[PDB]
Design a binder for these strands. Sequence first.
DNA 1: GGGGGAAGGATTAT
DNA 2: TCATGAATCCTTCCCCC
Length: 341
Amino acid sequence: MIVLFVDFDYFYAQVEEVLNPSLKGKPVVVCVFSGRFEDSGAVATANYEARKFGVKAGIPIVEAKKILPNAVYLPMRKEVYQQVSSRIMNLLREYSEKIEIASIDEAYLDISDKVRDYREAYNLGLEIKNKILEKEKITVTVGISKNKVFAKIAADMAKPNGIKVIDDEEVKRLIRELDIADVPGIGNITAEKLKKLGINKLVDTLSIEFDKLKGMIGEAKAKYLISLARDEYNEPIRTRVRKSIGRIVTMKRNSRNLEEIKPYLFRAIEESYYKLDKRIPKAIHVVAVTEDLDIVSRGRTFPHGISKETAYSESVKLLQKILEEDERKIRRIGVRFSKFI
DNA sequence: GGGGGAAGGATTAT
DNA sequence: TCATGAATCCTTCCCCC
Ligand SMILES: *[C@H]1c2c(cc3ccc4cccc5ccc2c3c45)[C@@H](O)[C@H](O)[C@@H]1O
Ligand SMILES: [Ca+2]
Ligand SMILES: [Ca+2]
């Protein structure tokens, strides 16, 4: 299997630069403003001019403005980015029908039937890079390797505006030298738990016994790291289907008074049904973000599709179950739909 | 025992 | 005084043959 992974560089920030080229060279910070208070929310992404100074995805906008008060802070325009993304994804389908769109700015292409060796692949990668740049003015990073994971790692090493191949030999070196924390799917919590087990590189997962790994990081993650260490990972590039869709809204003030919360929830449902866009869910979950920012949720699965009306009444019952089983105040209240017909 | 699948907290990446 | 203008992951837990 020969895999070509495309990762659009600082995508939201880049798209804003394309739509307003005068931003190029300036620190650009794309944020999600929550509404709770002045500059409350989080940074969705920052271009490298802003990243240099520590402004990166996930940090509070207030924290970012204390570092770069003069940087350009733009509200996230998801719809715009999604459309530019769709167009780029379409360009990618012209190089391979076997495409897995992992997210709005990442895609895996199984180009096995299209290229013979890694030299080909690389040339295709440069062709893909140039095409996107020409058609959309977006620079991407291409990662090429034997499976989806190393192609992603390849891209992680080559970004931004890069292209890296990791041949069957460098894979073996990485299985020994790469910080296991740099492996896709292993976030801060699993990394730290692996550290306490004594595992720091992929090869180490082989020295530990399975039941110990399984107990610490979980069966799924355990088999995954082991398969990677054994150089046996070969998951197929497949079409990804969004499994759940939701809407979470911030309330004007923290509450646990059902009638104060209701409007927000109902609006969340009303807007969720629009994003469902034809999809009919058989499951619904009411999500409550408490005052200490913890998450509590309650859901129910139906033997049939859920109508907006059924959603309205069931959500209230579910929200009551939250307020009943959890005593904290609700900051944000949302709904989530899944198990589509 | 384990297929199946529901529930919901845990985790990842932005 | 945090959001993904969340979504998925994935571990229980339970029914039931
Ligand atoms: C934000 C997002 C998306 C889809 C929709 C669809 C319909 C909406 C109606 C009203 C409000 C609203 C807010 C955010 C939305 C909406 C709506 C997604 O396509 C996007 O990825 C974000 O989740
Ligand atoms: Ca990216
Ligand atoms: Ca990404």
